[PDB]
Structures are given as C-alpha cells and as structure tokens.
Write a protein that binds this ligand. Structure first.
Ligand SMILES: NC(=O)c1ccc[n+]([C@@H]2O[C@H](COP(=O)([O-])OP(=O)(O)OC[C@H]3O[C@@H](n4cnc5c(N)ncnc54)[C@H](OP(=O)(O)O)[C@@H]3O)[C@@H](O)[C@H]2O)c1
Lengths: 998, 145, 168, 49, 242, 96
C-alpha cells in the first residue's frame, strides 16, 4: 500500500467557472418551469448563491435576455421564473465586483433510527425541528447544553423567491450571539487556551470571537478569496468532501487529492466544481496516497514549482490533511501491517507534509504567508474499543504545540487543531441514542461549517499568535464512561431488532399452522415484472389548434410544400447500437429496460424462442450461449456489466478486426546467421509465377547423374517472412463486440461477399425505413415514379477492408475473393442498397467529403430534390476503421496518442474530450448513419413521420485544394449579408407583407 | 474546436444574435468518437432526437473548457443534460480535410403544419397514426426473428 | 550540435543539406504545411528532449547553439534509428553497420566521433536504391567521407591456405 | 564456426539456452531490484538497514 | 512496375542440418514479438556479444516475383513532367501523381476560358460563389499503395500520405493553389460515370443559386494495385490473347 | 535523535517511532496472545511505559514527542479493549 500513485502529468485542473455559471443558471429554468423545484425548496436559494458567487457582466446579460424573454402567460411556472429571475438579475448586479462568499443553506438534519415492529432496523436523517436555519444552529451551539452548564425569522422553507433578495443584503447583527453564552456554561463549539500549568481550559472570550464569526459567517457568509489550500482525503460523502464544497464557494484555490483515481472519481469532482466553485476558485485533483513518503516529497514540489517547470506556481495558505483509512476490530494483539500503515497515512506523513512545505516556504524566503494547518483530532483516545492504532495516531498530534513554540518553523506553519466530533456518515444507528444525553451530533455538512469557520479571517490571526485548539465536540467528553454507554445503546438496538425479527416470523408461522398456507397463499399477492416494449419514437402530433398557434398565422398557404425538404426517417450503427440506444447513453447516461434489451439483442446476448424448450412452452428472450430462459427484468442485472464493458470507446478488441493487434503491428525484416556451408535449392510447387528474381547464378550439371531437380543458388537474395513491432494508438470506438448482421436478416452469402462497411450500411437503411413507417421500400412506388427515388449517400475512404485486400493483401499470396475491387468503391456501397432494397432509377450521386461527407450528402441530397430530380432521397454517410487507416492517422499525429493518455491517467471511456483544455486529438470510430429525406407535400400525402425541416445545408471551401489538414473560415459565408444601409426596414423579412403579395 | 467555436461566434456576432443569448454546444463525439465519414450523420441523427425531445445532451467528458474559448461569448459548453421546454432549431456544422466545411440547420417539424389547412392536417394525422402502428408491428416481427 | 541539427533538418525535408541554410528559420523552411513543422520539431524533441517552448521562429543557427552545448556526442534515439534504417535498407547483404564502422577506422582511420559524423553525413545523401556489392558500399562510404571531412576541415604466405584447402 | 552449428543441429544441443536462461534471469533481477530500491526510496536506507 | 515481373510472397531452398539463428544490434525495437520463448540461454557472461538465439519454425522476410498478362495501358506521353507547366518541385514531391495531373488541367481549362488568373472571377462574383464539383474514381491510388501496401514494407513513406489518398483532397490543391473558393464543396465518386455525375451535381449546384461558377470534371490514375484487380475481374482485355 | 526538526523528520525518525511506539504496542500486543492461549488470566503483566513531560516543549528532538505522547492513549484502551486481564498499564515519567 506504500506504492507510489502520483504523477505530475496526472493532475487535473478545473477552472472554467465562467462557463458553469451560465450552465447552472440555465439549469434552474428547466427545473422551475418543469416544476422539479418549487418556490419552497431549499435548493433554489442554495443554488442562487452559487450563481451569484460566479457573477460577471456576461452572465448578467445571459439571464437578462433569458428572463426578459420568458413569456409568463404560458403558465404559472413561467411566472415563477419571471419573478424569481428578476431578483437574481438585480441581485447579481450588486454582488458583482464583490468577493464570493459561501452561505450554507441546507436544512440541518438530525439522526433518526427507527426499527420496524417487523424487527427491521433503518437509519434516517430527518430535518431537525428546533433548528431550520444555520443561525438557529449556531445559537443552540452557543447556549451549550444542560450537561454543558457547569430570531430573524425568514422565508427559508416558506418562500425561496423572497429570500433571494435577502442574500446580497448584509443583514448585520446587533445583539452578538456570543452574549447568549450563559455563565458557567460551555457552548458546544468552543476554542481552548493553554494555561501556564500546561493543560487546555475553556476560555470564554477567545471562544467568543470564534463563535460569533461563525454566526456572522452564517448570515453574510465568509469569503476565502485568495486562499490557497491543500486538502487531502475527500472521498464522496466524507468528512472533508463538504469542506471542499465550502472552500470552493469562497473562491479558494484548492488542491484535493484522492487515493482511488479513476473516471467516476473525477466526474464526481467535475460535478463539484461545476456546481460550487466560484469566481477565481480553482481545484486540482491529483492522485495521491498519504502513506508514500516519496509521494509527499513530490506533491508539494508540484505545488511549489513554476508553471514553466510543469509545476503549479502556487503557495499554500492552509493545509487540511484529513486522509485516513478505516480499521476496526483491531485490538492490541491484532495491531499489525494495516495499522502500521495507517499510522503513516495519519501521523508520520502529516508530519512530513508540514515538514516539507517549510523547505519550500524557506527556500523562496516566504516568511509572511504562513500555512495554517488544520489537524483533524478527536477526543477518542483509546476510549472507544478496538480502532487499531487510530488513537496514538491522532493523540500524537497535539504534540504539535510543544513544537510551534520550540522549533523554527513557526513563521511558515501555524497549527490550528480541530476535532472530529460525532459526524454522521464517515456506527450511524446510535446517534439518535446519544443525542438524548444533551449531546449534539453533527451532519457532515454541519461539521463542515465548523471546521470551515476555522478559517475565518478573525481566527486566522488568532492562530497566528498562538496555536489554537478548537473543540468542535458536542460535549462528548462529559458523558462519562461513554464506551459501554455507547456499547449498550447498540446492544439494545439489536435485541429490540432481533426479538421482533424472531417473534414476528413465528407468529406469522403460527398463523400458518392454525389456518394453513392453503388459504394463506391467496394473500401472497401476484406481483408483475415489466416487460421490454421497445418504441419507434415517432414525433407526437399535438392537435391542430396548438400548432396553428406556434407558427405565424400568415404562414398557411404561403409555402410551396413541394419545395420544403423534410427528414422522414433515420437510423444508425455506432459504437452504441442503433439511434435509439445511443440517445440513451447520450441524453440519459444509462440504459433503460428497452435499451438494455435491445443492446442485449444486437450484441447477441439474448435470442428469441417460442415453442417448447424443457418441454414447457417458452416464449420470450433466452440466453444465446446457454439457451436458458431469461426474463427482461433480469437482463439488466445479468448483462449490463458486459454490454457496457464492450460498447463505446474501448481498448481495441482484435477479433473485430481479424487479428489486428495494435501491440503487434506487422512489418518486414530479416533474421540471424550460421556457420558457412550453403548453396540453396527449391521444391516442385510454385515454380510457375515465381521464377524471375535471381539471375544466372547456378553451378549447373546438365548430365543426368543426379536425379531430382531444383534451382541451385547462393547468398545474395532478399526473402520471405514478414515481422512485427509495437504501436501506440490503441483504442477506437468499435461497434459493440458481437454485432452480427445475421441478427438483422442479412444473408450469409452477402456477408461473405460484401465488405464490412457495406454490411453496416444495409442495416442502417432498413432501420431508417423502419423508422419512417416505410416497412417495405416498394410502397414508395405507390406514390412516386421509380425514377424519383434517389440516393445521395457517401463515405470517407469506404471499403478500406477491400483496399486492404488488393493494395496490401493480394501480393501476400493469400486467397482474396476476385470480386474484391468492386467493394473498395464508395459508389458500390450505396449500390447494394439499390441492389438489395430499392430498385431506384437514375444517375445517383455519391459525395466523398473526407469528414464532412455527411453534411455534403444532405447538401446534394436537398438540391437534388428541389431541383425536381427526385421526390425521395437517401442521404447519409458511413465509414470503417482498420489499421491501414489508423496508422496513417497516427503518423499524421491527428488521433490522440494512447500511451500518453495512460500517463495522464486518462481512461478509455474519456479519451475523447471535445472543447477541453487538455484535448489531445480525436478518436476514430466506425459505423454508418443515414436518413430518408423527402419533399414536404409528398410526406403529407404519404403519411410519414416528419422529424425535421432541413431549412439549409451548404458546404463551403476557401479555394483550390491546397492544404488539407487545417480548417478555416469556409462556412462563415453562410452568413454573408450586407449591412451597408440598415436604417430603413426590409419589407421582405415580414410575412404580413409577403402574404399580401402572394 | 478552437476554430469551430470561433466561426460560430461571428455568424451569430454578424447576424445580430441577441447579446447574452448563446447557442448551446452539443459535442456528440465524446461518446462515439469520430466516424471519419459518418460524423455529420450521427450529429444530424442526434440533432433530430433533440428537436422532438427538447433534451440537450451534455459533454459528460468536459473537465474544463479551455480559457481561450471564453472570448466566444455566443456559445455555451454544457456538461450535464438539459431538459428544455423545446428547441426550435439546431445547426449541424462539420469540418474535414480538404477544406470541405458544411453547416446544415434543422427547424422544428411543428413549424411546418402551420402552413397547411386544418382538414388536411388532421387528415395527415390519422394517416401517420396508422403507419406508426404498422411500423411497430413490422419492427417487432423482424427484431424477433 | 550544428552537424546533427542540420543533418536532421534535411532528412525530414527530403532535400540535401546545402539546400537548407542554417541562418533561415524552420517557419519559413516548412513552406506552410504546418504538419511537417510539428513533426520536425517532434523529431528533434526526442533527439534532444531539451527545447525552448516556441522554437518555430528561432533560426537554424540560433536553435543549434542551444542544442550544441547541452548535447555531448550522444547520437540520440531518433538519430540512432534513422542511421540504422539507412544501413539496413540501403547496403548490400552482410554489410552491416559494424562492418561499415570498422572499414571507416581501417581504410580511412576515423574514431567513433569522426566515424559517427561520416555515417551521420551519409544520411543526408542517401542512395535512392540498395547498393549492390561491397565495392559500392565502400565507395559510397568513402565518397561521403570526403564530404564529412570537408564539412569539418580534417583532411587525411599462401601454402598456409593451399593445404588448408586441400583437406576440405 | 560453421561445422560447429550444423553439428549442433544433430545432437539437438541448443547453444543458446546458456543465454536465454541468463537473459530471463537478468530482467527478473532488474525488476526485482526495481522493487528493492523502491523501498529504500520510501522507507529510507536507515530504516531498511 | 514491370508487368512481366509482378512481385509477391514466397520462400526458398534448403541446406545440411546445423543451424540455430541469431540477430544483430539495429532494429530490435519495433521488431521483437514474433517467436516466443525458444532460446538456449546462458545468462552468465562467459560469451561477450548478445543476440537472440533461435531455431527452425519461423516465416520470414523476402518478397518474390511472378508473371502477369494485362500488359498495355494508355500512358500519358512518356516524359511528361509537370515541371514543364510551372508546377513547383516541392509539390510534385509532396503530392500524389493524380493531383499533379489535375492542376495542369485546371490551369489550361482557365487558359482555355479567357480566365488567365483565377481571381478575375472575383471581379464579377462573390468569393463564395465559385464552386467545385470535381471527383475521381478511386483517386490517389498511388498513396493507398503507400499506406495500405507500402508502409508495412518498411520503406520511407512521407507521413502526410493519407491526406493524398482522398478524392476530396485532390480538388483541394486546386483551391489551395489556384482559386481560394469559399463553401461546402461537393465531390462525386461514380466509379466510371463520375465525370457526368460531376456535371450533374455541378449544374444543379449552379441553378440552385449556390454558385455562379463551378469546376466540374473527373480524373484517375493507373497502377498495378488497380489493373491487377481489374485483371481478375476479367474486365480489361487480356493482352496475351490479343 | 537530535537536531531533527519538522523538515528533517525522515528515515531515522520513522525508524525511532517503531522502536518506541508501534513495537511497544506489539510487545503488549503479543504477550496477550501468549497469556490468552495458556489461559493465564490471573497473572497480569504490569507494563511500565517510560513517558515524559516533553511533548514538543523542547526543541528538535525529532519524532520523539508524538512517540511518547501517543502512549497515554494506553488508558483509553485498558478500559475499552479486551486485554485488561493480562496487561495492566503503569505509566511512568522520564523526569530529568
Ligand atoms: N468522522 C469523525 O468522526 C472523525 C473524528 C475525528 C477525526 N476525523 C477525521 O476525519 C477526517 C476526514 O475524513 P473522515 O475521516 O471524516 O472520513 P473518511 O471517510 O475517513 O475519509 C477517508 C479518506 O481517506 C482517503 N484515503 C484513504 N486512504 C488513503 C491513503 N492511503 N492515502 C491517501 N488518502 C487516503 C480517502 O480518499 P478517497 O476516498 O478519495 O480515497 C478517503 O475518502 C479523517 O482525516 C479523520 O482523521 C473524523
């Protein structure tokens, strides 16, 4: 576990707040106008502060146009945003140019453990009743408790819209809540002060300015602008995951580290920053472990190095080393490796974190910017049971005061001890038990607030005269003999749980022998499993009154519908299957039931079956390998692991590419040598093509004294065995591993005769007609002449599997089907579409725009149709992926090197980062995608699903084909218009004027 | 992406798009990759999913959009899905080797039916309703067998 | 440093070393097709690892000075690879790099430092096809030697086998 | 040198196991050291010693 | 390309048995993952120079040759250089032969139209209304030969090689070197009827309103990767039986 | 160890921490295993931990403080844990 796990090249900087602010705002719209959030929900204000915190003049204009254009008459929710929005657009105009604060709004929740009379135990954290604000929390924190003895009422849970106006106003306090501290009474959150005897006693004044700064931090919120923080140990739902959310709101520049670096761990941290991080806030997620000395000797160097040396250029202002590993059940005779390891994560490396920011503080000469340390301490010093060596770990941290005065690092580090109080999360079922002893237990977000108030500009000075302790313990040092007082509260919760488990089952069993289960089975209700009912996703047609309203009233009778193009079907064969099962992992991030059965059927996991299997009539999905029946409710459990394991961008599976193994790219070489005695002969097989290399280089004897005949030769040739060597571009977005056309109804001959890419294109054209209510292509000919069904499809290279067969395979001397050139084309891939489905009838175009072919295809497809050449046109595009193509793209340095993505700790499912600071190139995938576009009025008298209205398509280029790999202005010309004189109004833009002319 | 975003800005900057009304960047390729030729037909394919769904997917692999992209004040770069109240039009732009650009925009189908008389519309309505069912039938027989 | 740089700057531009003057910059040098610029800068990066951040404007002679100092006779990976291909691809059978290097220090007597230079200068003027006999290889190496030497300025019994045959 | 090799064809006596052994014995010493110096790089040559 | 010596892949004749087989010190780096664990190692330094020690059971590395029939084609006149027309020396070394033909034909096509410098078009028409709807058959077959066939032969191929294999990127140099045109610019590939398709899309482009001026046309090349395929299709006339 | 302050805490200290703490812990942690296997529970072994009042009050003694300070946590356990019958803590003091 001491294995090094951090790379300077492995960091991950999140800073683009200026964007997430316009995202979070727009996100509010579509919860409020969709009633997902109501005017009473705590998040509308717990979110409005996160967007205020990210205020800019650009964002003001972003919500000005959005609010000022929200038509409130559309519904009551449209009024709820029209009114709430205007607050933010006026609130954000004030807190512009002011430092961003965090102001925690969540309802503080208390513990609540309830056992069923069925004997089933469950823990719930319900919202406390006496404290519904954070100010209510800090006062009941000040009043102490009955054992610790020796109101601006707002619209929080009532009207969140009017509270929005209260966020920017600085609701100043007059009666300081530090006055509410009763004499002889210790509050719940008190700082401490060493006495000349040596101990630490509750000081009242020194614990007053802490505690009111909290209460100030709760009405106005605290800002952490210009902070620079390291914080280790921040797992999802952990102690310091909630300080991170607070550090980030304040505008802190943070370093968070993680032990388990993966993609779900950063897509976590991405959602943290996109939600919370405010102007100037910055977090870096690096991989890390505390227990590796060679890894703290390297994380701080990475933080104290210039952005030229690859470093970070920062300087720490606060350190929060919270990172710990659990160990339980470890008593004194069980203390071993796992503990001796945990001692290093907590003690001797938190020591060498501080012991090694000084070396950097002191080499620069920085002695006026000291880094406040926040040691997470605890009152548990061997008072609980067998926590392992967790005690003398966190007990041997208050010795960090005997040194701030003794040693030399006082100017660069300032200790600020803290307390793990009783925070729930990370034993959770007896919290409600203890709180009956006048003891407070903290939610994580609550203990977040406390440690976070330990950074308040007030305390920061207070730490900077003397090391402070900050007892954030609810009073758990007062309840005496807490160990078994604890161990009893839970030993009772298992009795009262298990006895109502045993008594309940036997009485239910008693009820089965006096009445019998013959009548008790009618009480076992029949409960039905949903079945997979795929859909076609036809556009819904709202009634005519609804649509005659959305369009201008003058529009009717004003369009030549023969000239309005319109998409009518579409389909796809990607790495995610059809266009129905990619829109799921696109929009919804995970598969439905109808998406998991379809991805199960097109990957050849489940089959169908009706008839009699196991004698019994089985009708429904079955295994395909074992043929053993499987219900569509147990398919997401049984397969979703592999379906997602083998779909989308993946490490390249070689058997999808007939042996292409990117770690063994094959090439051409020669071999090692011998002791010299060698002329060299031949045999009697292929003398016929193969006879014109050498020359006249023999020691012939044409006299029959020998008997068997072979050309006699010597050194000086070049010959015949290829060889192999490694490669880097190592992932591509395959089609889901296992995809056979056989599944769709494509014959076995065609797949053996046709190139893979065409084999994709057919599957997409049937589904595109399926998706258009055209189940057999000939129905087209009921309405249109056979010569008016076009095709304007095209590929990139196309047929690259055949070019591989002739330009590369044929001279390798292996069987290549002699029809091979016919498939290499791009013309002859939309041919089989006509050869096998359509029977269409003209000169049929075929674009090849290296990557923009599929828009060009729509361009020529549209101009074809309103020219009058065709009423119906297939458009679209398709291409494949093999090594003849990727390797070329490799040496162009166009697709992302994969090894240098495995050294950025990037993962396969994330190496395609469009519009990203750390983008490195792209990822070639394989597949097809087509769509049937028709005239309009034909679609209305044919009765087909109209999905869109291609109102414009236009390809553009600079000039002569000059230099391919660089893009340019080209398309900007689709906006060429003349603004020389705009003072007068252009009548043609109005419809009420164009309607009169018509 | 530096250039594609650049050019979208001017054609909104030039056409007088309202200040503070950016278009929303949908980056389909994070899931699928780059199907060298099939690209604009995956992203036109998705763009139609959107018009009828009102659901704008997000770049679930967008760690940190580059600062140099901030100067383009006419474009967002989402990272979470966004159930809107309805998209009215989508622009599909695409670029490739050889300076072949290409930008096609799609309008929402419902703007069409505003151009036809009523009796013809609900006539077409019944017509599709029947085809939908038939297509449902055929899709399931084939899918099975 | 200048030697290697110039030689490596002409190998990726299919032109002889004379066509490329050190005074000019790669920016002009590429011609525009920036695809080669990245490759040319990347090829040198692996053969020097050290580089300023924006070399594309620094002249050839100016960019060589920085590399000349740091680099010390370490022919590098890229250079090593390139030379290996040259001898492998275009040299007769049995005429490996070892043989060529030995011949240079035997028939012309040049050490490793001088030997490497001659071999490095041979890459610039590669023969368009594989040489036939050892004579061609020997002549080519000798012909290249003059250029390399000039590029720097440093000019320059039987019966024991008869019976040894008979028993065979 | 020649009559040697062809003569080893006949006994099927591999002249190079005396090195394939030595080569695999070597890289599983480098990667074995690679562990053994990671610890001295993280435990320190005072602790391990 | 010598149609009487079409090159292919074969193996050679045998010896008297005494042979393990070594290697040298040059290309160990890409080329190391064929054989397996088939050595008689001695890792004890008693030897001195190091080479992987192996035996019979491989497949290796010299192509071979054998005859062919389709033996005539209509070359361009022997000796035709673009240099004669004014095409630079870099471009010919960088560009595929077929594009090198296409440029020469576009200048002469403008020469033949009283348009001596392409920019005069822009005196009358907007830069975005000069189209191009040219296309090839296979196109760039000399580059496909370089990557799908040449690159794994281990010989120097210019790393920009995929850019020329396209059909899009042959009418690119026309815009890159002559026109400076301005849109989405189409490109047909009709295996043999591309040059009429090119006029079809070329006309519908223009009366659509997209362009006022359009280059149409077609082009293709001939090498053995193409003829041999056409040979076994039995589509082009066998020459020996002629 | 002397002269070892916070930026000098390394191997020699991380070693000394084991001589003093985590192995005095595994001395007691391993006479119990023998106390308990025999069944001996009436003859407990009094431990005498050498403690000190120097808890980072002196200068740079290295990690000698949180070594001998994290030994009074040996009372939070004699009551908490199970080894009470075999071991009896009796802290002490390095005076001067
Ligand atoms: N909760 C309490 O009642 C209480 C009381 C006193 C003190 N504390 C302190 O609370 C602090 C904060 O965490 P928590 O304990 O509240 O919750 P926690 O869940 O213990 O936090 C644990 C974090 O440790 C990180 N981690 C674990 N092993 C690691 C290693 N080997 N190297 C680096 N990082 C490692 C992990 O980060 P990843 O999850 O990302 O790997 C993990 O999330 C701890 O530091 C603890 O000392 C808590």
């Amino acid at each position: 576990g001491v294995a090094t796990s951090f790379s300077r090249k492995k960091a991950r900087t999140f800073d683009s707040s200026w964007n997430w602010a316009k995202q979070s705002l727009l996100s509010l719209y579509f919860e409020i106008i969709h009633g997902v959030l109501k005017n009473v929900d705590r998040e509308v204000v717990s979110e409005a502060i996160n967007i205020m915190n990210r205020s800019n003049d650009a964002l003001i204009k972003f919500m000005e146009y959005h609010i000022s254009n929200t038509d409130e008459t559309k519904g009551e929710n449209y009024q709820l945003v029209k009114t709430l929005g205007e607050q933010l657009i006026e609130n954000c105009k004030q807190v512009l140019d002011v430092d961003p604060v965090y102001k925690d709004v969540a309802k503080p929740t208390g513990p609540k453990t309830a056992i069923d009379k069925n004997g089933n135990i469950t823990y719930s954290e319900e919202p406390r009743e006496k404290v519904r604000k954070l100010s209510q929390y800090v006062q009941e924190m000040a009043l102490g408790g009955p054992i610790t003895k020796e109101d601006v009422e707002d619209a929080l849970d009532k009207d969140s819209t009017k509270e929005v106006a209260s966020l920017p106003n600085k609701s100043t306090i007059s009666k300081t809540v530090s006055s509410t501290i009763p004499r002889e009474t210790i509050p719940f959150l008190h700082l401490r002060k060493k006495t000349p005897a040596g101990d630490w006693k509750y000081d009242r004044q020194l614990s007053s300015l802490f505690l009111d700064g909290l209460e100030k931090a709760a009405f106005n919120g605290v800002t952490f602008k210009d902070k620079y923080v390291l914080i280790t140990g921040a797992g999802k739902g952990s102690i310091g995951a909630e300080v991170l959310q607070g550090l980030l709101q304040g505008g802190a520049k943070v370093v968070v580290t993680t032990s388990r670096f993966s993609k779900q761990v950063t897509d976590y941290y991405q959602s943290i920053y996109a939600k919370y991080g405010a102007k100037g806030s910055t977090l870096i997620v690096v991989p890390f472990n505390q227990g590796s000395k060679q890894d703290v000797e390297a994380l701080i160097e990475f933080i104290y190095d210039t952005e030229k040396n690859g470093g970070l250029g920062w300087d720490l202002d606060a350190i929060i080393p919270f990172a710990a590993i659990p160990e339980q059940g470890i008593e004194l005779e069980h203390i071993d490796s796992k503990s001796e390891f945990a001692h290093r994560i907590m003690l001797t490396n938190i020591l060498r974190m501080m012991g090694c920011v000084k070396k950097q503080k002191s080499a620069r000469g920085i002695e006026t910017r000291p880094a406040q340390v926040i040691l997470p301490m605890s009152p548990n010093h061997g008072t609980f049971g067998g926590d392992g060596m967790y005690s003398e770990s966190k007990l041997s941290l208050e010795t960090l005061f005997n040194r701030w005065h003794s040693e030399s690092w006082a100017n660069q580090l300032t200790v600020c001890g803290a307390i793990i109080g009783w925070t729930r999360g990370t034993n959770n079922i007896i919290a409600e038990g203890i709180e009956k002893m006048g003891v407070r237990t903290f939610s994580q977000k609550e203990m977040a607030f406390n440690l976070l108030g330990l950074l308040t500009p007030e305390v920061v000075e207070l730490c900077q005269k003397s090391p402070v302790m900050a007892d954030l313990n609810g009073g758990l040092q007062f309840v005496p003999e807490l160990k078994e007082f604890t161990a009893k509260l839970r030993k009772e919760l298992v009795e009262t749980s298990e006895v109502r488990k045993a008594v309940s089952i036997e009485t239910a069993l008693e009820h089965k022998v006096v009445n019998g289960n013959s009548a008790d089975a009618a009480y076992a209700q029949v409960e039905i499993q949903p079945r997979a009912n795929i859909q076609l996703d036809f556009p819904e047609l709202k009634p005519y009154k609804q649509v005659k309203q959305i369009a201008p009233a003058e529009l009717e009778g004003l369009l030549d519908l023969e000239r309005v193009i319109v998409v009518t079907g579409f389909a796809e064969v990607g790495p995610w299957g059809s266009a129905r099962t990619r829109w799921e992992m696109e929009a919804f991030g995970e598969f439905s039931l109808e998406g998991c059965v379809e991805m199960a059927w097109i990957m050849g996991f489940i089959s169908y079956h009706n008839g009699n299997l196991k004698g019994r009539p089985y009708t429904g999905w079955v295994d395909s390998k074992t043929k053993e029946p499987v219900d569509d409710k147990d398919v997401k459990a049984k397969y979703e692991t592999s379906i997602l394991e083998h779909s989308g961008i993946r490490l390249i599976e070689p058997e999808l590419f007939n042996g292409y193994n990117p770690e063994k790219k094959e090439m051409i070489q020669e071999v090692i040598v011998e002791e010299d005695l060698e002329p060299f002969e031949a045999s009697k097989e292929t003398a016929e093509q193969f006879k014109h290399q050498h020359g006249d280089k023999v020691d012939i004897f044409e006299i029959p004294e020998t008997g068997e005949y072979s050309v006699k030769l010597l050194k000086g040739a070049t010959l015949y065995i290829p060889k192999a060597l490694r490669f880097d571009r190592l992932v591509a977005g395959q089609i889901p591993t296992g995809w056979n056309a056989k599944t769709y109804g494509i014959s076995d001959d065609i797949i053996s005769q046709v190139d893979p890419i065409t084999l994709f294109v057919l599957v997409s054209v049937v589904e595109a007609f399926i998706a258009s209510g055209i189940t057999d292509p000939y129905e087209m000919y009921k309405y249109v002449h056979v010569s008016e069904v076009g095709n304007c499809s095209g590929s990139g290279m196309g047929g690259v599997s055949a070019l591989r067969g002739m330009f590369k395979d044929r001279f390798k001397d292996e069987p290549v089907q002699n029809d091979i050139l016919q498939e290499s084309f791009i013309n002859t891939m939309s041919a089989w579409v006509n050869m096998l489905l359509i029977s269409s009838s003209g000169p049929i175009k075929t674009p090849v725009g290296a990557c923009a072919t599929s828009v060009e295809s729509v361009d020529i497809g549209v101009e074809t149709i309103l020219s009058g050449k065709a009423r119906i046109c297939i458009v679209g595009g398709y291409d494949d992926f093999q090594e003849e193509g990727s390797f070329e793209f490799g040496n162009m340095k166009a697709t992302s090197n994969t090894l240098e993505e495995f050294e950025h700790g990037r993962t396969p499912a994330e190496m395609s980062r469009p519009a990203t600071t750390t983008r490195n190139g792209f990822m070639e995938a394989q597949g097809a995608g087509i769509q049937i576009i028709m005239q309009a009025d034909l679609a209305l008298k044919m009765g087909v699903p109209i999905y869109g209205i291609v109102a414009m398509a236009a390809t553009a280029t600079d000039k002569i084909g000059r230099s391919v790999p660089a893009p340019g202005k080209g398309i900007l010309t689709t906006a060429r218009e003349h603004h020389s004189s705009v003072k007068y109004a252009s009548p043609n833009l109005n419809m009420k004027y164009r309607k009169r002319q018509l | 992406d530096k250039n594609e975003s650049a050019t979208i800005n001017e054609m909104m900057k030039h056409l007088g798009r309202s200040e503070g009304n950016p278009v929303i960047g949908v980056f389909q390729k994070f899931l699928t990759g780059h199907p060298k030729g099939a690209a604009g037909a995956w992203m036109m394919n998705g763009a139609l999913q959107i018009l009828n769904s009102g659901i704008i997917p997000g770049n679930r692999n967008a760690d940190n959009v580059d600062k140099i992209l901030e100067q383009f004040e006419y474009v967002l770069y989402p990272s979470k899905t966004l159930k809107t109240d309805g998209v009215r039009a989508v622009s599909i732009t695409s670029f490739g080797f050889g300076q072949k650009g290409g930008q096609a925009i799609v309008v929402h189908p419902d703007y069409l039916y505003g151009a036809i008389t009523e009796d013809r519309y609900n006539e077409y309505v019944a017509k599709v309703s029947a085809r939908e069912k038939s297509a449902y039938k055929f899709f399931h027989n084939g899918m099975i067998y | 440093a200048s030697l290697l740089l110039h030689v490596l700057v002409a190998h990726k531009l299919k032109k002889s070393l004379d066509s490329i003057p050190m005074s000019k910059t790669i920016k002009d040098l590429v011609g525009g097709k920036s695809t080669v610029q990245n490759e040319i800068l990347g090829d040198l990066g692996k053969e020097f690892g050290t580089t300023p951040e924006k070399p594309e404007e620094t002249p050839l002679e100016e960019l060589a000075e920085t590399f000349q100092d740091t680099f010390s006779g370490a022919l590098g990976k890229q250079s090593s690879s390139l030379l290996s291909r040259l001898i492998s691809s275009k040299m007769p059978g049995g005429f490996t790099i070892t043989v060529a290097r030995k011949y240079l220090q035997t028939r012309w007597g040049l050490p490793s430092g001088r030997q490497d230079g001659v071999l490095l200068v041979a890459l610039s003027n590669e023969p368009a096809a594989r040489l036939g006999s050892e004579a061609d290889a020997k002549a080519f190496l000798d012909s290249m030697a003059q250029k390399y030497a000039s590029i720097v300025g440093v000019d320059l019994l039987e019966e024991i086998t008869k019976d040894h045959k008979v028993l065979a | 040198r020649q009559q040697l090799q062809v003569l080893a064809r006949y006994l099927k006596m591999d002249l190079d196991n005396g090195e394939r052994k030595f080569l695999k014995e070597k890289d599983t010493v480098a990667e074995l050291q690679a562990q053994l110096d990671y610890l001295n790089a993280e435990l320190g040559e005072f602790f391990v010693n």
